[PDB]
Amino acid sequence: MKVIVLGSSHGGYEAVEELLNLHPDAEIQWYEKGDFISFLSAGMQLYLEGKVKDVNSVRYMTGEKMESRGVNVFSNTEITAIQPKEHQVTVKDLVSGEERVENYDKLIISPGAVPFELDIPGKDLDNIYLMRGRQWAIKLKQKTVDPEVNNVVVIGSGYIGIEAAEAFAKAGKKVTVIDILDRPLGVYLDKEFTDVLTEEMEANNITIATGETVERYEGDGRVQKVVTDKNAYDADLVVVAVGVRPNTAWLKGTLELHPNGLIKTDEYMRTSEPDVFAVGDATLIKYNPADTEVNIALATNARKQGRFAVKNLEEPVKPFPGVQGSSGLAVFDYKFASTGINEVMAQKLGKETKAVTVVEDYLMDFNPDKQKAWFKLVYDPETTQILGAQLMSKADLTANINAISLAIQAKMTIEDLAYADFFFQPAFDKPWNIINTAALEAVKQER
């Protein structure tokens, strides 16, 4: 059986891993149009902050290692088109210019996504940077030590924008974050959490300019000003982290796509055409909190989809279990994690919810290491089933969100979590831990 896998990132990589243990016998070709196999864009912040010194070690696989396992790796080779009926792809070797047609028995594609750019006046004056991949990582790192860069503006206040804002504020630069949305990180956290984080960022000289539409970049040759409908900001560097666009335009007319460019797939990762599977940021995934399909562009999602595509290679036998959208990050001293439905998700999906937020020390009063922790539990008003949770503290309590992700998947209720058995030892927690305490509050609220 000959299987071709497109993409060396999270989705494509895991499909190769599951093929190696489920179909050791197969001829496997792995294609990457880029020069570098499996660079980890998630590790970019650690590199930019100087935690990791070698940009080339921020990866999880090399072509050499895969070839030792019998995989045919083709870097600098792009799959230009798919001919689904006759089961062929045309590939182009980007270093020699040679094209060729390759046949396959099964095709798994994980084409990914590309940074969204603002198509506005000034669009590409110099020093308007993006944040994805090895080349952008290197360029961003050189700007971190440049004495000419004094003011940097990042557009977008989501996960990637706040990572870039923290990295340049730690490098000693003045940062302004601009967005149309009213709160940074609203897709991940609710207002009681983002109010605390806004203060922490402002204490580290990051200005957050919310509710402003960027209209043009101004500058002579290189960017010098970012002007919005409401203001003008000096900028020596702009990082655009507004969002991501599916890399699927080349597939229009070949595979069925959603209006927004996402590939249509079912619960077995099958596309509209026989024997081609699609995985990763370019697809929608089953979202268990609301029993619907949502696009959640995370490495965890792409890796699970990748393995499920190989499981369903010959027969639709293993439907995808679904996910909860779990994410976590540190912003200066605060470490937060969240899963399931929050206010922005509930609004987008038209979902009614109830919630309780508990803010108190996570260790007993006599223990001098005690610190404040914020925990919000979101539940369904009719069934009281768990729908989401968010937590934050300067102490790392993030592994507790893993228990809430399972609770949502299992359809547990506030009563189940109020009395769930979690260990107690006073150097680690209180007799009723952070999850028990918030659920106990919800039980009182619903009496």
Ligand X SMILES: Cc1cc2nc3c(=O)[nH]c(=O)nc-3n(C[C@H](O)[C@H](O)[C@H](O)COP(=O)(O)OP(=O)(O)OC[C@H]3O[C@@H](n4cnc5c(N)ncnc54)[C@H](O)[C@@H]3O)c2cc1C
Single-letter amino acid code for the residue at 2: K
CA distance 385 to 320: 22
- Torsion angle defined by CA atoms of residues 397, 398, 403 and 404, in that order, rounded to the nearest 10 degrees: 110
Closer by beta carbon to ligand X, 33 or else 376: 33
Closer by beta carbon to ligand X, 76 or else 224: 76
Closer by beta carbon to ligand X, 320 or else 362: 320
Please report how close the Cβ of residue 146 comes to ligand X at its closest, in angstroms.
20
Eight-class DSSP state of 252: T
Please report how close the Cβ of residue 1 comes to ligand X at its closest, in angstroms.
21
State the Cα angle at 366 between 360 and 371, rounded to 5°: 35
The CB density around residue 279, as the number of other CB atoms within 10 Å, is: 33
Please report how close the Cβ of residue 424 comes to ligand X at its closest, in angstroms.
31
Residues 6+ apart with CB under 8 A from 194: 183, 184, 185, 186
Evaluate whether 378 touches 355 at the Cβ level (below 8 Å).
Answer: yes
Please report how close the Cβ of residue 309 comes to ligand X at its closest, in angstroms.
12
Among 384, 391, 369, CA closest to 439: 384
Three-state secondary-structure class, residue 315: coil
Closer by beta carbon to ligand X, 92 or else 311: 92
Closer by beta carbon to ligand X, 11 or else 219: 11
Interaction site with ligand X (CB under 6 A): 6-12, 31-34, 41-42, 44, 78-79, 110-113, 131-132, 160, 247, 280-281, 297-300, 302
Evaluate whether 27 touches 2 at the Cβ level (below 8 Å).
Answer: yes
Please report how close the Cβ of residue 247 comes to ligand X at its closest, in angstroms.
5
Please report how close the Cβ of residue 203 comes to ligand X at its closest, in angstroms.
24
Please report how close the Cβ of residue 302 comes to ligand X at its closest, in angstroms.
4
Closer by beta carbon to ligand X, 131 or else 387: 131
Please report how close the Cβ of residue 10 comes to ligand X at its closest, in angstroms.
4
CA distance 262 to 271: 11
Three-state secondary-structure class, residue 156: coil
Closer by beta carbon to ligand X, 12 or else 289: 12
Bridge-based pairing state of the strands 232-234 and 225-228: antiparallel
CA distance 99 to 86: 18
CA distance 167 to 332: 10
Closer by beta carbon to ligand X, 265 or else 437: 265
- Which residue is listed with tokens 């927690």? 429
